[PDB]
Each structure stands twice: as structure tokens, then as C-alpha cells.
Amino acid sequence: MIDQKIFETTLNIDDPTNFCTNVEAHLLKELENIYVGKCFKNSFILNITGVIQRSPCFIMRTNNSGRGYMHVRFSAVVSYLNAFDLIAAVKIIKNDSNIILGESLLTEPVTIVIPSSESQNNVAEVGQIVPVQLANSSVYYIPGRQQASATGSIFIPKHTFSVYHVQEELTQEQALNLTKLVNIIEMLLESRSKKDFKQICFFEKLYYTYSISSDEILDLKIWKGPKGKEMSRLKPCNVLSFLYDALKNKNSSLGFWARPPNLLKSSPLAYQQDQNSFNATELPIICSAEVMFVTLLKEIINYLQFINDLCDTFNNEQLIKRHENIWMLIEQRK
Amino acid sequence: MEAGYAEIAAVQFNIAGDNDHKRQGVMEVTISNLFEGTLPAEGGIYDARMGTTDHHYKCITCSHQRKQCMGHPGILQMHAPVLQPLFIAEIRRWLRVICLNCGAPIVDLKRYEHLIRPKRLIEAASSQTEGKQCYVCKAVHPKIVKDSEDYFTFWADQQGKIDKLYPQIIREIFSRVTYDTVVKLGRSKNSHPEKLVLKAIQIPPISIRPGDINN
Amino acid sequence: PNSILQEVKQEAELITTEYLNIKKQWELQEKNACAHLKLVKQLRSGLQYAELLKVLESIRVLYKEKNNTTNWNLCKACGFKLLCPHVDMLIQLQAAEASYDTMRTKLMKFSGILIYSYFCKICGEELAHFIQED
Amino acid sequence: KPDPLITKNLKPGANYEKLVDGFVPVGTVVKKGDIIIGKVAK
Amino acid sequence: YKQITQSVHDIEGLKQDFRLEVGDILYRDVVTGDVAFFNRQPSLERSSIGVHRIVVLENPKISTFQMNVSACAWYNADFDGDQMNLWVPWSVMSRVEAELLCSVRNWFISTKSSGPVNGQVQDSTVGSFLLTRTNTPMGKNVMNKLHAMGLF
Amino acid sequence: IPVYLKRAASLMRMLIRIELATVKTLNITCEQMSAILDLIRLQYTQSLINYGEAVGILAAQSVSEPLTQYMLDSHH
Amino acid sequence: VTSLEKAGLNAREPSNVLLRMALSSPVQVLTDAAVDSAVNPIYGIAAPTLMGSVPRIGTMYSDIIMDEKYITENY
Amino acid sequence: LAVPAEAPIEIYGLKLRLKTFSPQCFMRMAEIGSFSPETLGYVASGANLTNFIRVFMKCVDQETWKKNGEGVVVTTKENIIQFTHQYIELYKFLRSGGHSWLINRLAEEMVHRKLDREDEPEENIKRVIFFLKELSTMYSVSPVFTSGYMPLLYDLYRAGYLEVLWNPVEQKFLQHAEQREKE
Amino acid sequence: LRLGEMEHWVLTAQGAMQTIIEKSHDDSDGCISYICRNCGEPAIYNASHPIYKCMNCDVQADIGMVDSRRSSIVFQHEMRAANVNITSVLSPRVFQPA
Amino acid sequence: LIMDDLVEEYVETEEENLVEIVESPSICEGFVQASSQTLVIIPDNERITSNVLTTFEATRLVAVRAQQLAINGSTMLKKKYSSPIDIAKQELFNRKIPLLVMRCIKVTPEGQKIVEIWNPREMGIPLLD
Ligand SMILES: [Mg+2]
Ligand SMILES: [Zn+2]
Ligand SMILES: [Zn+2]
Ligand SMILES: [Zn+2]
Ligand SMILES: [Zn+2]
């Protein structure tokens, strides 16, 4: 996810006297020329926010060049993708030799290889923009490279889900930390309104585990807007309100938690149970309220960004028509 | 990019185990061929990934010419382990202070818990310890005999029962030594005796063996 | 300079006229502003070997003539010296990741004329060196 | 006496003249860059 | 070394350059007044390496490093077969240092004995005695104006 | 002032108090005395050892050089 | 009273592995440094020289930085 | 004790070592800035910054063995299955995007907090300076005055003309300086 | 022609440098060494062919430019050939409080 | 059968006489990078080093300035000199040198590089001219 980062580096100054007379500006220019758009220290670095601390322009001591170096401690805006990250725009550039290459068209430049041994793949062709979910293998940020490296696959609703048992109560500091993700979700929901409703409905129908009756029943829009589909069993709970009144000490997160496929994978909806009524084929993950809340909020952010990027890349019906195999295998695995 | 200016402030010396060789090796030597015509044979000791010493080819590893290439080490996975030639005395000292069955120290660590660290192992190995009984597995420590025919062969003397201590057996013995025993004997955690036996030796960069040491 | 001219007879005026011509041409070259001046600077200032071929093609755009190996090349937008033919071959070999011996052998067409170095027949630039063969 | 086709490594700044049948004749002044005794491999 | 090409150019291939560009590096011959490092092995003293101003001997038949006999005390040298190493600093920093830090004027006073190193030697000592003595076998040690001028 | 720095100037203090005694400075004006003190301060500053001197190597050279002469009188 | 031999150097600068290798007996010094995991700070002359660097003495004892204020106000 | 690789051992229990690291270790790691979020989170749990390891693993404590070093030890078989499941979930979480964001934000905040927490001449000397002010226009002795006027004396030494300290002169070798500059 | 041990001792007794630098690096085998600064091992840096990598810790490579000589690089390679690990700590970066 | 090029076997004889615990964490083993330092500049009134440049410092300043004028050359000097060495020397003498002298007094274990910053334009110059 796009985030800030603080880096430490030593520059090289070939004209120390000219590099002065404007040190902050020349420093920023050199940092942009060196580190912008290049993987460095387990991150990608998109732009340089500014210089926090810096050294005096020391003259090089071990050579007779007269050059200076200077140490720079600068804050930069970086992108760190993770496993299960949803990239809605991946352009395939290679399909022969059973390697299936790709390239993300999103803000985060990751080049994604897709396994060909799996029968699910080998359906996309060159020049086909199709969403991809990153595998659980960690993104590979080679220093100095112009793009990240990861392995992903064609996204599937993934009916398998996890149940989180919560035995530790939230604290005030942890809730304040979660407020950042709550704000990120709030901006995501705000941006959700600009995208045209019919495209978001079509995409959300496509990437849903179960079947929704021809994208006409109800008007799922979240950002408040209390709607809901499927409703296999039990009542969703609004995680945003729960975290907001968690700051107010008017609630308890103790219990069982899950986000089953019946829930909308984009909505701020979750079940706070006490008996593990869910029929998942896995034992509950005993953890704290912070762990479960962070996991659910990251899932919500990933899905909201996924829907927004899907609406961004396919902004017309010509692209939808062009993708001759993308939209029907996803409806096949339902 | 843009490798910034730097100066070396300190140098750390350590025993290089086979894990370090595997991490630092850019290539694995597998063949005995030297040159494939006018070019080094791939996988040989002259392989260009190790650096270039001739104008007739570049490096490959660093894509530099002969002048700008500092050379890069390789790996030779030994089919049988070898003892580190520089630390034969350290192997001998470690063999005489730990039980060859369970790896526990046959010596009393409290006995040497007043000496300086560089001397604890030397004094532990100075004591006889032949015929001592392990308090863990009740085994009898043999007589560690250094063969007089070469600088590396070790002999296990069990009241006349003579058996050769092969580097594989020595590695099995040294791998049972805990880091607690290593520290209590005055050695660094980077000086674990498990690094004294090499299953993957480092073939040096061609920069230090130009086109005899390659024979 | 005077004693050189009295001891030179009409050729004396040719000397001091050609001298003024070269001086004005050199002043114009110093004040020249063809777009290649940043381009030739970028070509020789070591950058990535993938970018170098693109820049060298960008230089080839401003070529006045296809000079295999005869003489200099001129900035088509200004008519002044642009790039020696050996630089084109040298940049070709750099991108090809050719060896030093291969570069020396291929560049043994611009060789002019202990120095241990070959120099260009056109621009007198160091092509390569040969001290000893290993 | 090597030739341009015989080159592959001709010494920069060398003369390669004054060579008769591969050797500089007796009585010839030879300077720093002059090639005395011409020998070619391959 | 042309900056625009970032490479070294032979002087015989630069017949069309007329002048030199700013940022160019010219490798010129050693001239009189240049500083040079003079060294005699074994280098045992702080004055074993000193910096002298170069005087270029234009006689083609001279192949030796000539020096004043009073400068030999710095190097413990004599003119009976001794060989000395001489290298001219070419870089700017080295030249600055040679003319500012390693010049033999800094080694006139010994670092060892805290006293002078150089002075009159052999012919100069005897000559000073002969010039400053009151009487010669020929009478009072005097010279006319012409020979007094010739001393200077 | 640290004690060792006070002891470092003991000899120069002695020499100044001897050579600038009242009996010896009767024909010196106050401005001349100021000039004399300034010259002494300048000469003292010019005599200090430089920061970063390799004085160990200087001592090694200065003591090893007489050793060859000590050898040259080994038969004496 | 330490000596000027190898023993005196060992007593005075045990950590300066490079200096002791440069003096004499490089093989034993290297072996002992590897066994003891010796950290060798780079100081003096022999240690920087063996690492290809220059000693930080003489002209290099004090480092030089650019007077940024003065350069800005006097271009 | 220690056993060699691929050596048959018989598992009676399993103890997780709750390693404790100082916050300075995490601060050094954040200053290096290139560590993966899993190791960063592991060390932050080692310190008292995050408690995710103890959050995930203290639910299967079943303390029956002690032995000095702090940790959790599982003896019964079902406790072993629960311990393994909790370990797998904990380490999947440490490599998850949510904990990656949390640990990157924590390292950011700590480094940012640390960085933001970081931050009359005497009559004779008057005359001498006046003399050097005229000499500055004609010789490289651009004058400055400090308390002891040590640079002033040093400049009066290189050029000669140290006599101005005690003699009126001044104009004597001022014109000599004019002649030298002219030459 | 050799500038031996005693010549270097004399030059460093004068406190020269910049002449030890010139003769021993620019007029000798002086080169550039690259160290990862995270593990201390010799790193692989190439500007023309884009190579910024470390055979040790990979994503943690922070390559520093260190002036060195080919003799010292060969000496360290020889020490490592005898299974002695050489790690260069590298001078820490110093920052002025903003 | 006769080999002449022997290698002269080499012998070292004077031996040196230098005078819970878990496997390894990510802190004790590793962290070769060394923590970054902060520059603690001593206040001008607390400085104890000489206000006069040493010959080493002045020589280094002149060399650095002249090398910089080799690639640059925008000079604040009044009189024109034909060599960078003379220009740098006159810049030092005219107190127009754009460099500063940092004297690292001490590097503390806590990570402080205590230094004294000296301005060569307010310092005594010991060089000759
Ligand atoms: Mg003699
Ligand atoms: Zn290489
Ligand atoms: Zn046992
Ligand atoms: Zn050319
Ligand atoms: Zn590394």
C-alpha cells in the first residue's frame, strides 16, 4: 500500500561549490533523479516528500577529486505491496513458454508472473488488462529496479474464509492507531461515489462468491447506505461504527469474528459472534482485538481499492467486450 | 543506484563457514573443464561469473571489463567434508573438551569461569580428559590423537581401539555442541566449532588466480 | 608572428587570412548552440547501455551524411562537428557488451599514423590500448 | 614482416619497417619504436 | 583529456582544434619551475623525500639528476654512483602539497637534532676560510674592485 | 587552564621573566614591550606541533638514524 | 615496560589485527583474529593502508566542509 | 543439548522462546530501513512495542516445565496441535498486509519522533589594523580582528612589516608594497 | 619503479597524503571498492549495466563507494579464500540536527 | 630431475599471547551497519582548539580549493591569476575561501560526533607568500 518512508543515504556531489548557493533544492533534485521510481530498501519510492536531516557537504578525503558527498535523511512516498493485494489492472506482455508474464497498470509498478501449470490460467492473451491477486509469497523489491516483482494469479472470489477468536480487549492507543485505517476507508468510500454505479455493480457481481439476482435487487453502495445481499445467516455489524465508539469505551470486542463469503467483500460489515456459528473448515484464530480489526480493515481497504481500480480501468463497454474470457470463468467458479 | 561515498571504519574477522560460502558464492563449480575454446567453460574454475582476468571477455556477474572487475567467489560442493586447514588446532582443542557422543562438554565449565575468554578453551584442552565419563550419556572420552603423517588427520584412541576421525564424523560431533558451551569456553558465537568443517569450499575469484595456483 | 611573415610572397596574406577564418570559426563553435551539444554530452556521460543506443540513434537523426569511415559528422541543424564515426561503432560495441579485445580489433579501422595506445585517424581519440596480450 | 591483414595485435606506434625477411639488416640504426625481428603466430 | 568526450585525445589528432575548451585536461611537458619529489633510498629521515624546483637541462647529452652539493645532507647522498628517484606531481592537490608542505626549506632544520642540516661542504668551507682569512702567503688578503665584483 | 598546560609553559615563563626583567627593560617603551610580547606570542604559536602529526614515525626515524652510526663504531 | 617487538605490539594494540599482520607473522595473527572474532578499528597508518585507504593524519587529519552560508551569500 | 541435522529425536513438548529485545534494537532496524515487515514485527514483539507474539501464543501456555527462560511450553498432544496452529496464524499475520502497514507505521512514527526530538582593538593594534586596511588593497592581507589578534600578527609575519608593532614606519614599506605590486 | 615501505613512512612523517594518494592509487593499482554497508561484504555495483546488488542480504543492499587498491581487494579475497570472513563496518553516516 | 626454483618453506615461531545463551538473535549477530551519528557542533565560545590553521589544515584547504577551481572557476578574487594553486592561495590569504574546517574532537558511544567548526577566514594563516 502507498505509504510514507524515511530513508538514509549518501549522495555524491561533483561540484560542491556549485551544489551550494541552493542546497535544499539541489538536494531534492538529486534525490528525485536517484531514488524516484526505483525499488530501494524493501519499498518502491514514488516521490520525495522532503529532507528531514542532512550532513554538511564534506569533501572526499580518500581521493584527489575535490568532490563532496553529504549524507541525506529524507522522507519519501513509497509503495509496499503485500500478499493477497488486489491489482485490478494487469497487462499481459508474454504468453508463450508457459510463463505468463504481466505488468500492473496501477499506481504501484509491480511486474507479476502468473503460474501456467494451473489450469485456471492460460486464458488471457497479450494486451489483456485483467485483475490479479498477489499470491502468499511476499513481493520482491530488488534494489535499483524500476518495478517490483511478485507472483500472482487470476482473482477468484475465494469462498474459503477465516474465523478470528478475540480474547483480548482493544486499548485506546490501538484504537487510535486503527483510526488511520478507518480514515483510509473513509476516503475510499468517498471516492466510491464518483465511480458510475452500473460499473461498480457489474464488477461486484463478477467478484462475488455466491449469485446475486441479475444486479438489480437492492442498491449496494456502502458508505452508510444500509443494504445487503445474500444474507445467508445472521446480522452484519458495522466495523466503522464499532471502531468509532470503541474510542468512546461504549463496547466490547470480546467474542468470535469472521467475514464469510455471504458478506460483501468491500463493505464495512462483519459478524461479532460468541459461538462460532460459521461453518468454516478451520479452527478459530485466537488473537487480540487489534489483530482481528487490522486484518478486517486491510481486507476492506484491499477490496474497496480493488473495486475502485476496476471501475477506473474499464471505464467503457468496449474494453468489457474485448476481454473474451475474463468475465465468464469468474462466473463459472460460483 | 548511485553508490554513495563511504570509508571503512572497522574490519571484522571471522571463521567463514560453508553457509557464508553458499551465501557469498555467485556460482557453483561442477565440471573440470577450463576453457570452451576462446571462452571459459561454464561451471568450471575459470568461469567468467567469477570475474574476468582477460580482455577477451567481460565478467557477467558485474558486467565490467578486466580493470573494473574485482572478482567474485564461487562454490565447490564437496562430496565429503573437509577440515579447515587454518584451524586444525582449533578442531583439536574442541575435540578434547566435548563428548563425542552427545556433544556435551566433558570438562567442568565452572572450573574455567575465572580466566579470560581467549584462554578458557586452551586450558580446557590442556587437561587430559582421557577416560573421563560423560555425565549425560555415560560415555568414555577417547584419546584424541593427532596423526604424525599429516597436518589434518585425527585418531580416536579408545583404550587401544583405533578409529579414524573423518571430517564427516567430526562435523557430526561438532554439530552437537551448544552455543552455551561455546560461550562458556570463551569463544564467540561466530566461532562455533560447526564452522570448522566445510562441505562447500570457496574457490577464490579469478582476480587472485590469473592465468600456478589453478592446477 | 611578424618575423614569421617577413621570412615567409602572396602566401603571407593567405596565412593571416586563414588564421582569421579559423579564429572566427572557433569562436562560432564555442558560441554554437546546436541541440546535439546536450545530446553528445549525454552520449559520453556514462548512462545505462540501453539508454545509450537510444541517445546514439537520436544523434543519428541529426546526421548530415552516412559516413562509414571517412571524416567527421556535422550537426544538420548547425553544420558544425557532431560525432566521429568511431564513436558510433564504439557505442554499438558497448551496447553489444563486446570484450576489450573485440573492441580493439573492430576499432582497428580508425587507427592513425612507448605510447601503448591506438588513436583515431579522424579525431585522434584513444580507441584502445595494447601493452601485452594475455 | 607482418601486414595489416597479419595484424590482430600490431603494436601501437611501432615501425614494422626496416624488416627484411623478418629481420632488420646489419648496419641499420634502430630507434625506440622500431620493430626488430618480426615474428607472427597462427 | 577532452571533457565533452570524457576521453583522452592524442595531440597529433587534435590538429583541427585551434584552441582548448574549458574543462579540458592538458598533459604538458615538465618545465623549469615545476616542483618535483626527490628521493634517495634508503629513505631513513624526514628529509629523505624533498620537493625541489625543477631546472630543465636542455643539453641532450645530460642524463643525470643534478643537485647542489649542499642539498646532499638532506638525503645522505654523495656523487659516487648514487641513484635518486624523481617524480613530478601532476595532480593539483599533490602539487599544492609539494610546494606548501614537502619543500626542502621545511627540512633545513633537522627534525632529529633540532639543528640546521645544510651548510658549506668541502670546497665551500675551505673557500670561506681562504676568503675570510686576514693574510695570504702573498700578504694581506685583499682583491681589487674587478675581482671583488667577480665574486658576486 | 589545565595543570599540565601550566607546566608546559614553565620554561618559557622562566625565560621571559629572566630576559624581560625590569633591569633588562629600562630602555624599552610600553608600546615596545607590547610589540615584544606580541612577537613572543607569535613565535610560541608558530613553534607548536601540528594536529595530526605522525610524531611516532618522526621519533622512530630520529632514533633509528643514529643507530647506523652506532654500528659504524662497533669495532671501537 | 613493553617491547618494540611483536609482543609489545600485542600488548599495546591487540585489536589492531592489520598492523600486527603487517609487522610480522601474518598467518598466526589472521588465524587468531578469525578464531577470536576480532574487530579491527581502522586507525593509524598500517591498518588504513592494508585496506587500500589513506591514513587520516597530516593533511587528512582535519576534514573540510563547504561554508554553505558564505557560498550562498557570495556566490 | 544439540542434535545434528536429520537426527531422530522424540518430541515430548515444545517450548517457544519469548525473546526480549531492547527498543534500541528496533530503532536501529528502523534506521537501517530495509528490513522486511515480518522481522520488524518479530523484533517489535520482542520489545514492548507490539505484543502480537504473546497475543497469539499465550492462549496455549499450559505452564508445566518452567526452566528459567520466559516462554510458552506445550506438553499434551492437543496442546501441540493448538500451538502449531497458533504459530502458523501468527507468522501468516506477521507477513500479512495489515501487520505490514502497522509495523511500517510504527517504525515511521518512532524514527520521526526521534528525528524531531533531535532538533575593541588596542591603540597600537588599531594603528596596525589601519595600516593593514591600506595594505589589503595592495597585498593579500585582508584583515580581520579577533581578541588576541593572532591572525593579525600572522599576516604581519608572512608579508614582513612586523616592525609596525613598535615602530611608526607604516608609510615606509607601504610605498615599498606599492612598488612590489606595481612590479 | 617502486615507492617502498620507507618512502611511505617518510611521506606520512611529513604528513603529506594527496601524494600517497596520487602515487599509490592514481599512478598505481588504485580502484573503487563497493561494500553493502548492511553486511560489510563486497557488493556488486555497475552504473552502465544497471547492477545494484549484494550476494549477501539482497533487498537490504546499501552500496557505498569506497576508495581502495586492487592489491587490498586481492588481499581480502586471499584472506576469504583461507576461510577468514572479512567484513567492513564502514563509517556511520553523520547528520546535522535540522 | 634437478629442480632449482625452490620455495623456501616459511615458519612462524613466536606464538601470540593476546590478553540462557541462544543461537543468535537479529541484533547480537549482525547490525554491522553501525548506528548513525548526530553532529554535535561545539559552541564557538566553548572551542578549545587553536584559532590558527595548522600547515596541514591550510595546505588541505588550498589543495581542495584549487582542485575545485580546476573543475569550477567562478572566483571571488579581484586580481587574475593563471593557476588554480595561486588562486586558492590568494583566496586563503584574502580570507575569501568558501571552505570550513571541522575538527572531530570525539565520537561518543551514544552516537554523537562532537566537532569544532572553524572558519578559515577568521583564522591565522601560517603559509608563505
Ligand atoms: Mg655513494
Ligand atoms: Zn566482475
Ligand atoms: Zn556424552
Ligand atoms: Zn575518432
Ligand atoms: Zn549485504
Helix boundaries (H) for A229-313: 239-246, 289-313
Distances (CA, A) of E121 to A87, E49, E116, E131: 90, 21, 13, 15
Instruction: Look up residue B43 and give its three cell numbers.
Output: 561451471
Residues 6+ apart with CB under 8 A from A105: A89, A90, A91, A129, A313
CA distances from A333 to A299, A322, I14 (A): 21, 21, 82
CA distance G62 to G56: 8
Q: Residue C37: CB partners within 8 Å, gap ≥ 6?
A: none
* Chain H interface test: which of I52, I60, I89, I93 (most H C-beta within 10 Å): I60
The one-letter amino acid at F63: V
Q: Which ligand is nearest to the CA of I64?
A: 5
| Chain E residues with beta carbon closer than 8 angstroms to that of G59 | 97, 101
Provide the 8-state DSSP code for B93.
Answer: H
Window 11-40 of G: residues touching I by CB (8 A cutoff) are 30-31, 33-34, 39
Q: Is residue J44 classed as helix, strand or coil in its secondary structure? A: helix
CB B186 within 8 A of CB B117: yes
Residue of E nearest to J129 (CA): E100
Instruction: Give the distance (Å) from ligand 5 centre to CA of residue F15.
Output: 62
Beta pairing class for E49-53 and A2-10: unpaired
Spatial separation of the C-alpha atoms in residues D26 and I92, rounded to whole Å: 68
CA distance E96 to J129: 13
Q: Over the Cα atoms of chain I, what is R_g?
A: 16
Distance from CA of H67 to the nearest CA of B (A): 15
User: Which residues are found with C-beta within 5 Å of the ion, ligand 5?
Assistant: I 36, 38-39, 54, 56-57
What letter represents residue B28's amino acid? E
Report the distance separating Cα C71 and Cα C83, nearest Å: 10
Q: Give the chains touching J; criterion: ≥3 Cβ pairs < 8 Å.
A: A, B, E, F, G, H, I
- A295 and H96 within 8 Å at the Cβ level: the answer is yes
Q: Going by DSSP bridges, is the β-strand pair A110-113/A148-154 parallel, antiparallel, or unpaired?
A: parallel
Q: How far apart are CA J87 and CA J110, in angstroms?
A: 42
Q: In chain E, whose CA is at the least distance from the CA of C123? A: E13
- Report how far ligand 1's centroid is from the alpha carbon of E82 (Å): 5
Do I86 and B19 form a contact (C-beta atoms < 8 A)?
no
C-alpha cell at B94: 574442541
**Cell numbers for C19:** 588564421
**Grid coordinates given for J7:** 620455495
- Within 8 A by CB and 6+ apart from A235, the residues are A271
Resolution of the structure in the document, Å: 2.4
Rounded Cα distance between J41 and J53, Å, is 18
Q: Is B55 helix (H, G, I), strand (E, B) or coil?
A: coil
User: Using the 8-state DSSP alphabet, how is residue G60 labeled?
Assistant: G
**Cis check: omega of the bond before E42, within 30 degrees of 0:** yes
**Beta-carbon neighbour count of residue E113 at 10 Å?**
11
Q: Give the nearest partner residue to G63 out of A17, A22, A58, using CB atoms.
A: A58
Check H118 against I60: CB less than 8 A apart.
no
Residues of chain B by 3-state class (helix, strand, coil), percent to 5: 25, 20, 50
Question: Residue A153 and residue A333: Cα distance in Å, rounded?
Answer: 14
The continuous run of DSSP H or E covering J102 comes out as strand J99-107
Closest CA to G74 of J101, J76, J122: J76
Determine contact, residues B178/H2, Cβ cutoff 8 Å: yes
Nearest Cβ partner for C101 among B56, B63, B211: B56
* Contact state of F45 with J52 under an 8 Å Cβ cutoff: yes
Q: Judge whether A294 is closer than 8 Å to chain H, CB to CB.
A: yes
Q: Spell out the SS3 assignment of E62-123.
A: CCCCCCCHHHHHHHCCCCCCCCCEEECCCCHHHHHHHHHCCEHHHHCECCCCCCECCCCCCH
Name residue B65's amino acid.
Q
Mention every residue, 6+ apart, whose C-beta is less than 8 A from residue E18: C22, C23, C25, C26
Is the separation of the CB atoms in E40 and E84 below 8 Å? yes
DSSP 8-state code for residue J84: H
User: Can you tell me the distance from the alpha carbon of A271 to that of C121, in angstroms, rounded to the nearest whole number?
Assistant: 83
Could you identify the residue written with the cell 564515426?
A: C85
Look at F32 and H162 and tell me if their CB atoms are within 8 Å: no
Method in brief: cryo-EM
Q: Locate cell 527462560: which residue?
A: H69
* H148 CB burial (10 A radius; 0-12, 13-18, 19+): middle
DSSP states of I3-20: --HHHHHHHHHTT--SSH
The CA-atom distances, in angstroms, between F25 and each of F16, F33, F39, H156, H163 are 11, 8, 16, 24, 18
Integer Cα distance of B160 and J55 in angstroms: 75
Q: Pairing between strand A71-79 and I44-46?
A: unpaired
Copy the grid coordinates of residue F41: 606570542
**Residue whose cell numbers read 591483414:** D5
The grid cell for A152 is 500472482
Q: Are B136 and H3 in contact (CB < 8 Å)?
A: no
Q: Where are the alpha helices (DSSP H) in J79-127?
A: 84-93
Rounded to a whole number of angstroms, the distance from the CA of I51 to the nearest CA of chain C is: 10
Question: Minimal Cα–Cα distance from F60 to chain I, Å?
Answer: 10
Burial (Cβ within 10 Å: 0-12, 13-18, ≥19) of residue E108 = middle
Q: Rounded distance, CA C80 to CA C82, Å?
A: 6
d(CA E152, CA H119): 70
Look at B177 and H2 and tell me if their CB atoms are within 8 Å: yes
D8 CA distance to ligand 2 middle (Å):
26
- The residue to which cell 563428548 is assigned: B99
Q: Judge whether J7 is closer than 8 Å to chain B, CB to CB.
A: no
Cβ count near A6 (within 10 Å): 22
Q: C72: CA distance to ligand 4 center in Å?
A: 8
From its phi and psi, is residue A98 left (phi > 0), alpha (psi between -120 and 50) or beta? left
Distance set, CA A225 to CA A196, A222, E72, J49 (Å): 16, 5, 100, 73
> Are the beta carbons of A119 and A149 closer than 8 angstroms?
no
Smallest Cα distance from B174 to chain H, Å: 9
Asked if residue J111 lies in contact with residue J85, where contact means CB atoms within 8 angstroms, the answer is: no
Q: What is the DSSP string of H36-55?
A: -HHHHHHHHHHTTS--HHHH
* Residue H117 contacts I where some CB pair is shorter than 8 Å: no
Alpha helix ranges (H) inside chain A: 16-19, 23-35, 172-194, 197-206, 239-246, 289-313, 317-322, 326-332
- CA H135 from chain centre, in angstroms, equals 48
Which residue intervals of F1-76 are DSSP H helices? 3-8, 10-19, 30-46, 55-72
Contact across the interface for A11 and B4, Cβ inside 8 Å: yes
CA dist., res. B184 & res. B113, Å (int): 7
Cell of A160: 474459503
Query: Number of Cβ pairs closer than 8 Å across A and G?
Result: 34
State the burial class of residue E58 (Cβ atoms within 10 Å of its Cβ: 0-12, 13-18, 19+): exposed
Identify the sign of the CA torsion G44, G45, G47, G48: positive
- List of chain C residues whose C-beta atoms are within 8 Å of the C-beta of residue I47: 46-48
Neighbours of chain A (3+ CB pairs under 8 A): B, E, G, H, I, J
CB contact under 8 A, B62 and I44: yes
Counting other chains too, the contacts that A187-190 makes at CB distance below 8 Å and 24 or more residues apart are: A188/A301, A188/A304, A188/A305, A188/A308, A189/A222, A189/A223, A189/A304, A190/A223
In single-letter form, the type of residue at position H182 comes to K
CB contact under 8 A, H141 and J93: yes
> Do residue I40 and residue J36 have CB atoms under 8 angstroms apart?
no
Distance CA B127, CA B96 (A): 9
User: Cα-flanking dihedrals φ and ψ of residue E34, to 5°?
Assistant: -65, 150
8 A C-beta contact, residue J85 and residue J101:
no
* Nearest-angstrom CA–CA distance, J12 and H38: 49
Helical H runs in I1-98? 5-13, 20-21, 70-81
Cα separation of A141 and A242, whole Å? 36
Which of I60, I97, I98 is facing H34, going by the closest CB pair? I60
What residues of chain G lie within 8 A of the CB of A16, using their CB? 66
Q: How many other C-beta atoms can be found within 10 angstroms of the C-beta atom of residue F52?
A: 21
Using CA atoms of F44, F47, F51, F53 in order, give the dihedral in degrees to the nearest 10. Answer: -160
Rounded Cα distance, C39 and C78, in Å: 14
Are C53 and C43 spatial neighbours (Cβ–Cβ below 8 Å)?
Answer: no
Say whether residue A241 is in contact with chain J using an 8 A CB cutoff.
Answer: no
Mind giving me the DSSP string for A113-152?
E--SSSTT-S---TT-EEEEEE-TT--B--TT-SSEEEEE
Interacting residues of I8 by C-beta distance below 8 A, sequence separation 6+: G49, I20, I24
Compute the distance between CA of residue A51 and CA of residue A49 in angstroms, rounded to an integer: 7
Helix (H, G, I), strand (E, B) or coil at G58: helix
How many whole angstroms separate alpha carbon J68 and alpha carbon J64?
A: 6
- The span from the CA of A239 to the CA of A150, in Å, is 31
Q: What span, in angstroms and rounded, lies between the C-alpha atoms of A25 and A10?
A: 16
Region of residue D3 (left: phi > 0; alpha: psi -120 to 50; beta: else): beta
